[PDB]
């Protein structure tokens, strides 16, 4: 049977193709901005040839496979993701932009083959800094005055940039601020050895390379429930939209207290896109103006037309300090058909922290184990940088 | 500086040509138009004319500036006037129009044909706006229309045409003069237009059509071109001039087409083939005269031609012709086809070997045609039914590479009709079908073919031997199938089993029994299809089978009786 | 469309690929601008020439292209020519080369004995060499070759390579032992076992991934052995990097499909015991049973592992696990609840959009095979409102499979909410329906809230046609399980169809059926519904017509018995009456006659045949 | 009415396009490109001279002569030694008018620029244009005669000579 693999950019340009084995001879390509989209093409004749395809998107690149008949679209896709990833590690990382890919098409091909013949698709599968980056995203549902965290997705990436030369081991204990922290995901250079390392602990082995040590996606709902956390800071940003409006204005006081962020380390970029429902009101009905919002460390720019707030809090505001973002929304209307209601819908607040724990995975201690001492050559680096992205908090009022 | 002005103006023009603001560039253009030089006047005028639309100051300024340039003949007068007019015409305001008209009128009286042509074109654009002006100038046009220079005439004509597009009544007035000019012109392009104009007037005024028709056909006869010929044809076909009374005129036109089709240039060929087809839809007789032209176009390699031919083939077929065509297509396709199924080579002549050639969209149409042909009359006369059957089976194979499903569907529908007709051929058709089903390539992609097959089998299982392979095929392939097919299959199977049991005398054959058991398990499995309808269909047929089995076990002879006792009971029970 | 898009992608690769090839050649003499060439009609000659160029960059580049083409489907591509040249290069001591070469070989071996044998001899020799790196690569190819003759070779080798202390070799020796069995099975099994064992006990991810990728193959057949070996594998997973964990999942999928070791008495008292677990009989540790598979450190560790890996917050290991759990399962395994819980926790955890869908799919698959599990997880899959049409569609398909009682109330509340809220596309709303339906199929206590919601949605919201098709299929399913809520439902539907005479072809097909169906419960009333339908056949598409016929037909039946003995008319037995007899031929006939005639006249034969039969059977009583 | 003319060189670069009416430029281009491509796919002997297309062959690729169409737009191509000329006309202008205007244009160009190279065309693009315009105007080709066209070009060159740095 044959399999082929192709890679394409976001703009649908083919970047790499491969075939394996055997006899081998527009919307999805576009939809690809949705990061997911390209999907099967049937070349086909009754030799069924089936095709299939699969595609993968990552960081503007996409990958296509094909398979012949049977194997299932899954085996193809699994083979694609395994490839894509292998392309990220190699190419260091930050982007595989069509420019980068096309650059390493060869290393992409071989990487493929090695994944095939074996028969089977083989399946598809010195300085230390710990930079915990965390991008929260949380979907709150306001009910009864308490914003009950309905969902939330704090995506932690714990990266650790390193410069060792040998293989020291790192233990990283993560504390639970009694939220059994459940799953830290670990990078291909990281080991969580077995319940020896308990679910709360992680152990990483060198790569040379920066490495995401553990991505932790805490689904706040369970946590917050297991932990009881009305986020009192973070995430539960209690936005009380006060009427006392007039025909055009309204004052909503959103305090993003960082009471619960004291050790959460810096937030590199909290972008609060306040969407104002425009789905039910027509973005023209929602003309709205945001006049004053006070941050102490960031900037409020407004994209009204589009029906959106963006408040970008710069990384300097860090602890305990509570960036209270008050201000006033003025719904400007070219029509009268705006009834001075904007159901206030979903204020998505995407926090990105750095250096703190997505689940509360704060690393309470990092300990190197290898009969090593400090200054026996091991140095504590600065500038691991995890980044975590999800999508995005959503408080629904 | 003047040389510098010319430079600036170039840059502005380049921007206005893009799709950029034009208002922003007008003032700068005017200052350039205030330069006495005639060239700068021209380049300025072009920019302003590309821009002016709506901005009044821009226009007013341009006007006053163009006027001063017009009034004076100017002696490079042709150019200055010429450009200015174009300019003014492309400018429209009522204030301007009022001015321009008087200016154009003066210019219409220049000697130089270049000037006369421009002036005419201008008065066209103006009229497109301001009727009072038209009226006052209507007269001048008539006088100009009579100048000796064919280009001037050609222009007077175009203008009258536009004004007809907008006003026809005024020009239905001038039509006589237009008819007199067309009768005096030597030039083909000019003749072509005049013809178009009359067609345009005809859409409005059948009276004109009559006067002009004969002027067309005489002109086509005196010009060679080729376009004048095509034109007369399109006019005849359009005015709907034709009406059938006018077949005669049309005939002459066609005869000229057939001659041309029979020139080497594909543009002319394609055009003729089209015009022929159209006429045919409209006049079968012409088609019979032009069959030869068609067949010849079949051996032509041009995909647009081939397509147009196949379309013609569909409305012409005679029996000998049919058979010829069919074979010719089948053969061609085995030899003309591939290129684009595979991808998409472009064509070559040269390889003496030939890259070979049909697109996917052609392959689909071809198959569709073959099906229609077999069903028209009715081709009770494929004499050789065998050939048809073959062809159909072949098409199915190649289409497997094509998909487009619709090909695969149409082919099946036909194959059904053929089988129904031609009892002989049925066995052959059934055997082939079964084999195709057991070749996997049909399973992929082709449910329809599977369905039709299934049907043909329940109907003719009474002819077929191996009612087993059929059934064990179908049973094994059932899990691989679409819901519509699955349903069809199940149903067909049951039909067979019922017939068999009644007819199984082959021996009963122990197989009927085994086959019944299998069919049972399967149907149960399908009882798990996402679409309940199909599910029940299975369970139902499961019971039946179970019964027949109990019967066959006791005897062979006693089976129909037993089945006529139980099976209906069961089925009715479940459903009941 | 798709073929043209593929050609455009190939041209784009040739543009960028040809520029990259030219820049790289500066060195490769050059082979940089090739690709972009062949990618737009590249050929074998260019390739072979590149191998015969002398420069290592070239020798390497060549090997590359060769692999890409034979891979790209430039199918035109012979592979024997590349083979021989590549094999000659196998005997080069350069690892990079050896690697590429092995990658190619398997490419061929996929077919030819000499080429295989040649590669095998060269591989064997390199296996009896002390160099663990080459031995491994070589052993790997030997495994992807397929052959039974190569077994006695590969074995002696494999044995020696397991007994080698090296982790690389141990990775490969597993691949071999595996691809070896996949062929010459008997002579080789005793050893190939005691071997795979020692191995599995290595630390290196490429070694583990390999022994795994191996065990996954040999055992398809010799599953007793695999067990003792499968353990460390399952352990190693729970302990490991989220990449390698996905691999171990795939395998643990196949193995299970093979070792069900046998149930024979299944001891559920072995450890930590699931059903129980043997140990192998040949080891004979007190035979421990078979269903080993669901229990035993091997299988179990697998299931539990899958769970952990999924609990382990990584969306990948999570999606995979779900897939594996889909196969093992004796349906008793998935019922494991744990598997589901995991998948769920992931989904909701998964913030990342690509993943949201992935999770939504898995969930569906698992609900498909097991619903009652995804239950303590639903409130989770309440649908993330930020999402796409497919995503919302999946959520629905889930909520529909999950419904338990303690979960249902919430679920319904969510759906109802989503329908009202999202600007939901038609397709969504469509699925949203198919769900709520699949729900009451399980809960009765909650079913009321469901149906009420559905109806209120249909009647209330402004729904599309396609959507109406689903809702119809739903209300049908619920009635099928909850006949008490049923009658209420039917009344609500009959009212809706009668309103909508416009309905879609599929919708009519639905409604018309539901009423053919519910007719048993009270087919005294159904003749009223059938009338409202027939009236509208003649104006409908073929599929719809078929449906209408059937449902006329059915209704007719259900009541023949209840009609017949009733209709077999003035037969006396009918002026005698059980209960339905029902007034029978007249009321039912009037309906069927219309239907029949309507079918005979529709092009689709199936509709006609049915009508014909239906009439014949109905008529004769 | 010719709504536009395009003159491309061998390397497919357009060198002159004239649009007598407005049409949306983004649409005009798409047409020009498709035409360019098809030209390349067509063989030197074909070079097609034209590509009439039902719209659906707008481009569709499947039989690679898929021609190009855009409905109501007929495309006429003319290859000459190294330049290609393409004319796009509306359905209402007769093909012949279009062809003649082309053949006349081309002949004129070869006569005026006997060796045309891309550099010469470029440099004297203004001249090439003028020729095209003159040919067009009042809708009219008013001198049709290949002899005049040849001269007229010289008449224009006489002007630009008097201005030449704003020009050359």
Numbering used by the authors:
A (entry chain M): 1 to 25, 39 to 138, 212 to 483
B (entry chain A): 63 to 638
C (entry chain B): 1 to 621
D (entry chain S): 1 to 168
Paper's wording?
Heterotetrameric adapter protein (AP) complexes are required at several endomembranes for cargo binding. Finally, AP-3 functions between the trans Golgi and the vacuole in yeast, whereas mammalian AP-3 localizes to a tubular endosomal compartment, in addition to or instead of the TGN. Here we present cryo-EM structures of the full-length stable 300 kDa yeast AP-3 complex. The structures reveal that AP-3 adopts an open conformation in solution, comparable to the membrane-bound conformations of AP-1 or AP-2.
We selected three classes, which showed the most distinct conformational differences based on the gap created between the N-Apl5 and C-Apm3 subunits as well as the overall length of the AP-3 complex in the 2D class averages and the 3D reconstructions. Indeed, the overall length of the AP-3 complex varied from 11.5 nm in its most compact to 13 nm in its stretched form. Similarly, the distance between the N-Apl5 and C-Apm3 subunits increases from ∼2.2 nm to ∼3.9 nm, demonstrating the variability of the “open” AP-3 complex in solution. The large α-solenoid domains of Apl5 and Apl6 contain several hinge regions that allow an accordion-like expansion and partial rotation of the domains. The general organization of both the compact and stretched conformation of the yeast AP-3 complex is similar to that of mammalian AP-1 and AP-2. A direct comparison with the open and closed conformation of AP-1 revealed that both conformations of AP-3 represent a more open state of adaptor proteins than previously observed for membrane-bound AP-1 or AP-2, in which the N-terminal region of Apl5 is rotated ∼31° (compact) and ∼38° (stretched) upward and tilted away from the core of the complex.
